[PDB]
């Protein structure tokens with residue numbers, strides 16, 4: 219089909235997949251002198267390959283276990299998006315070839331398998347782009363990372379479900395954190411895509427609700443040129459606001475953090491969104507003098523029992539179905555498979571790449587839960603007693619001719635318990651509700667790398683105003699310090715003094731003016 | 742946007758999802774359609790512009806909704822789809838240019854699919870600042 | 884311009900009325916800068932604007 223590189227395996231039911239194997243594509247500005255050629259992906263993403271392995275492991279465990287889906291095999295056709303909308307659209311067009319050729323009837327292999335369900339993309343923009351085409355045929359799409367609030371609009375994204383909570387709770391949690399540490403002068407940075415803008419707007423509204431003044435609001439992108447990034451760094455420099463709120467992903471934030479480190483801008487506290495609170499692209503020790511002591515967010519860790527061994531068992535020659543294994547081997551051992559020559563028997567446990575050296579599984583558990591949710595919808599179809607099913611007159615879908623819309627209908631009314639004991643249900647908005655873990659960016663005393671240690675949680679189930687819990691004794695501000703940094707716009711006025719309006723400046727900033735002769739102010 | 746929207750239907754209770762019916766009627770949309778038709782016909786009539794060649798057209802209705810526009814765009818790029826995906830009727834017309842949709846979300850959705858084949862899209866009504874990012878909307882004009 | 888379709892005067896859409904010459908702007912807790920009070924100047928002080 220379109221993408222020549224893929225990881226596919228035949229089966230009775232085919233499940234699509236869209237994982238970022240690369241962080242982006244080559245910056246090739248085509249002048250269209252000749253025929254345009256397919257762009258190439260540049261920076262390998264080991265996190266994406268681990269997510270792909272998570273999906274493959276879940277499918278293999280489904281096939282092996284006879285309790286869940288007996289006498290039925292699950293296949294997959296997993297592709298690469300490279301964090302790019304065009305590549306994911308090509309992969310999706312590969313997914314919907316059968317349905318679209320049926321709808322259009324161009325009269326031609328007549329044997330292309332039909333994709334029952336698709337595990338959604340990572341980025342919010344790419345997920346929306348894929349959903350706009352997948353929901354056309356009502357093929358369910360269970361995303362694992364896409365957390366945009368725009369994707370809860372079931373009017374537009376009919377067949378979209380996700381295993382990760384949206385950014386409403388994340389923005390509420392960041393506002394709660396800001397008001398918990400007694401700050402009113404902050405700054406906002408957002409990625410110019412469908413993920414950063416809605417979250418930053420929600421946080422701005424909530425901060426204005428809580429009387430928090432935002433000094434600056436700037437948008438960044440992975441393809442930002444020198445002038446725009448220089449302007450952003452200048453507005454960060456001129457600002458007196460210490461704490462800075464960032465709603466961005468790793469690749470979208472890398473250029474800005476590189477420029478900040480090059481200018482050695484220090485003294486800022488970064489409130490990281492979950493996207494880059496654990497991004498190895500920014501969580502590098504050479505940046506710790508700038509990004510140290512960054513308070514971020516992380517989802518609840520899952521427990522996949524045999525996942526570690528399956529990750530360790532990847533072999534370029536023993537993985538016939540996985541076509542991404544060769545590039546993974548080449549990029550993890552810096553060798554060429556026919557620049558040294560790969561021996562074909564090296565040990566993966568020797569290299570330190572974000573594929574096996576993980577503390578917790580957060581989005582890998584989301585992928586596992588997505589695959590299990592699709593499998594459990596299929597099983598619910600399998601064990602549907604006639605006369606009492608979700609269909610008309612209590613009828614049940616035929617296993618030999620399951621259609622995507624039936625799987626989506628069963629997914630809407632799904633209620634199952636995962637291996638951790640929690641109940642997995644998708645709301646009418648199609649999303650899921652989960653707790654948040656608040657982490658801080660420290661430095662390893664024995665390794666020197668960035669270490670994320672938990673400083674508190676954010677219980678979504680609690681009542682408003684009591685969700686946030688912070689254990690400040692475990693926090694090291696700016697990576698090393700202990701005192702809570704000062705981030706008022708202006709110093710507090712003491713007794714006997716009155717607030718003075720500063721023209722053209724937000725209400726969080728004022729000048730202290732002493733009370734007149736006949737007047738007093740106690741507090 | 743000949744129609745302003747579509748009817749309401751959800752909760753596919755064993756009902757295989759069918760095409761939704763557009764509800765209202767926009768006479769401005771039909772005007773715009775006739776504007777494009779008239780321009781094409783006068784270009785064909787004029788011998789000065791494009792000698793010895795006739796400009797055809799193939800126009801659909803978006804109903805101000807993403808799904809209808811996506812179906813129209815899929816019908817647009819079927820020939821380039823066959824060329825690229827290597828997936829026939831052997832008579833699919835070669836659409837070389839698409840006059841863009843009206844809505845900004847509709848234009849974004851159509852452009853995310855047209856930019857794969859680098860088909861130019863000269864919209865007339867979409868005016869969001871998000872469509873100026875040429876890193877993503879490679880073949881979108883305004 | 885017919886303002887509301889019938890009128891001819893520019894509507895007033897400020898949070899608080901302009902303070903007089905003898906008064907000065909005073910903040911209100913929880914309100915933006917466009918909303919203020921009209922605290923009178925103390926004795927010995929003046930304001931012309």
Ligand SMILES: *[C@@H]1O[C@H](CO)[C@@H](O[C@@H]2O[C@H](CO)[C@@H](O)[C@H](O)[C@H]2NC(C)=O)[C@H](O)[C@H]1NC(C)=O
Nearest residue numbers: 400401402429430703704705706707709710726
């Ligand atoms: C930064 O400004 C905030 C106000 O925006 C200060 O928070 C106030 O703290 C006092 C006592 O700690 C409370 O009585 C007030 O109610 C708080 N303000 C609000 C609006 O609730 C905070 O103390 C300031 N930080 C510093 C270091 O001065």
Ligand SMILES: N[C@@H](Cc1c[nH]c2ccccc12)C(=O)O
Nearest residue numbers: 340341342363364365413467493
């Ligand atoms: N736009 C993506 C950002 C992202 C990239 N990698 C991630 C990993 C985990 C969570 C989020 C991300 C999202 O909201 O999901």
Ligand SMILES: N[C@@H](Cc1c[nH]c2ccccc12)C(=O)O
Nearest residue numbers: 769843844845846866867868869
């Ligand atoms: N009703 C508007 C539609 C429109 C104009 N500009 C837009 C920009 C984005 C989306 C829609 C529009 C019109 O007829 O002109």
Ligand SMILES: *[C@@H]1O[C@H](CO)[C@@H](O)[C@H](O)[C@H]1NC(C)=O
Nearest residue numbers: 448449451452453455456457
């Ligand atoms: C920021 O400060 C620099 C140096 O003082 C100044 O040149 C610039 O105009 C200021 N504002 C912005 C938006 O850069």
Ligand SMILES: *[C@@H]1O[C@H](CO)[C@@H](O)[C@H](O)[C@H]1NC(C)=O
Nearest residue numbers: 479480481482483484507508
């Ligand atoms: C950056 O600034 C910090 C501030 O203490 C300093 O320790 C460090 O040496 C500086 N590095 C460079 C490269 O200027």
Ligand SMILES: *[C@@H]1O[C@H](CO)[C@@H](O)[C@H](O)[C@H]1NC(C)=O
Nearest residue numbers: 632633634635641642643644
């Ligand atoms: C899901 O099933 C469990 C099993 O007892 C039940 O307790 C729970 O209420 C169910 N949830 C919904 C939303 O039906």
Ligand SMILES: *[C@@H]1O[C@H](CO)[C@@H](O)[C@H](O)[C@H]1NC(C)=O
Nearest residue numbers: 640652653675676677678679
């Ligand atoms: C979320 O946090 C609360 C408070 O710590 C806890 O009671 C609850 O069990 C957590 N949620 C899950 C799914 O464990």
Ligand SMILES: [Ca+2]
Nearest residue numbers: 284286287288
């Ligand atoms: Ca089974």
Ligand SMILES: [Ca+2]
Nearest residue numbers: 721722723724
């Ligand atoms: Ca100002």
Ligand SMILES: [Ca+2]
Nearest residue numbers: 787788792793
């Ligand atoms: Ca002519």
Ligand SMILES: [Ca+2]
Nearest residue numbers: 427429913914
């Ligand atoms: Ca207020």
